[PDB]
Subunit: 246 residues, 2 copies
């Protein structure tokens, strides 16, 4: 992206909902971005499940994921959500955001390989200390909403340090909503409800392919109350509906 | 093998529609149909040919890559929705015939023929005009053949880079949900003439859970108003089988 501008009027939705948060929306053809808050747009947060994006990419590249037709066989042990207690494809694993699958991918990737790809991808603060299967969840990895849109735009252009086919595979895995007139590729994130003072963070990042334009977006909010969670989709949607995008 | 499923003709009787549905679970070695004779009968592909045409355009460099924009020259096009710049998915999704006609002209007769031979695409007959053999020419393809072709595409087994196959596959996404993804393309030759009906198509595949279902539907049609039956009849069979 080439420019960012602040549209304070985009705080209407956040205020309406009593939410501390940011939305960044960028247009590929002008390489220009808008946000409600420049400051929060550059603040860095645990990526949570948004990290499945780079992790899918590295697992593909390293051959820890064979190809897009890979089945992740459920062994039969209880998992944190009923949604995960089944065999899964990559898209499947991504869409039901199955943590144990990507924890296992992270473990086959390994500290060394994981660490390298994040430097090539310029992925946030690139800090994977705090457990190879835990670092994006409760460790010290941080990424900003601006850095998310930049990572995603590189993905969209196949300009990440991976094979073109592996980037394509992951973009298809990210398809979340399809219509004749638009295609949405997106991924949610939720680190937890936080603790004393210190709230968790919820994310929604992706892009919308519409007419011959592409809108990249990244949303995060502070969250202490798990019921406020759906706002990670409804607030960006409101802003993107306002803009006549979707 | 192809096996008749007797209960499927029910949907065809109800709308007074001669057509065929072919459905394959996992691979094309085990497919089911309402009619064994009609399953392998060959019809004009119409806009289902945008599939091989898109792959060929990519393979030949005619379409530079996935972000190619097909610019509208400003000249009259047969549908208002085609009168605009379009991306590859865009052109596939509104079925922009002129985008694909120009694709075909640049590919040229010699290359077009070679790729259809390579892909085993129907009778591989491109006679009738480089920019219209699939519309009104001598090109014919069966439901069974569509399913075979889509299976090769799905498996990245066509004679084309995997990257190009992936590109066309994402252009075909038509419905997305956490548990399933549908890639599909409609076709419609037209309404035909006295005693010679046109054909309507819905073909593609559903990736659901850990399984893949390949489908091809066609029907004889002499009335544009009957056109939504090309989606509803097959959706009604796939819904009954718990697939969508």
């Amino acid at each position: 992206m080439g420019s960012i501008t602040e549209n304070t009027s985009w705080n209407k939705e956040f205020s309406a909902e009593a939410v501390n948060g940011v939305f960044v929306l960028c247009k590929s053809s002008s390489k220009s971005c808008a946000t409600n808050d420049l400051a929060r747009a550059s603040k860095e947060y645990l990526p949570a499940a948004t990290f499945k994006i780079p992790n899918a990419i590295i697992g593909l590249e390293t051959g820890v994921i064979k190809n897009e037709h890979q089945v992740f066989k459920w062994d039969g042990k209880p998992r944190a959500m009923k949604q995960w207690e089944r065999d899964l494809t990559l898209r499947g694993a991504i869409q039901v955001s199955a943590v144990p699958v990507f924890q296992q991918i992270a473990r086959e990737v390994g500290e060394v390989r994981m660490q390298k790809y994040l430097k090539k991808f310029s992925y946030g603060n690139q800090n994977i200390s705090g457990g190879i299967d835990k670092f994006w969840l409760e460790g010290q990895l941080r990424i900003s909403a601006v850095n998310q849109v930049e990572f995603l735009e590189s993905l969209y252009l196949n300009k990440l340090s991976a094979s073109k086919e592996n980037q394509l595979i992951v973009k298809e895995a990210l398809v979340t909503e399809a219509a004749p007139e638009y295609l949405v590729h997106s991924k949610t994130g939720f680190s937890g409800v936080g603790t004393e003072s210190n709230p968790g963070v919820a994310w929604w990042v992706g892009w919308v392919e519409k007419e011959t334009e592409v809108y990249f977006f990244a949303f995060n909010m502070d969250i202490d109350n798990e019921s406020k969670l759906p706002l990670r989709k409804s607030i960006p949607t409101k802003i993107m509906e306002s803009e006549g995008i979707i």
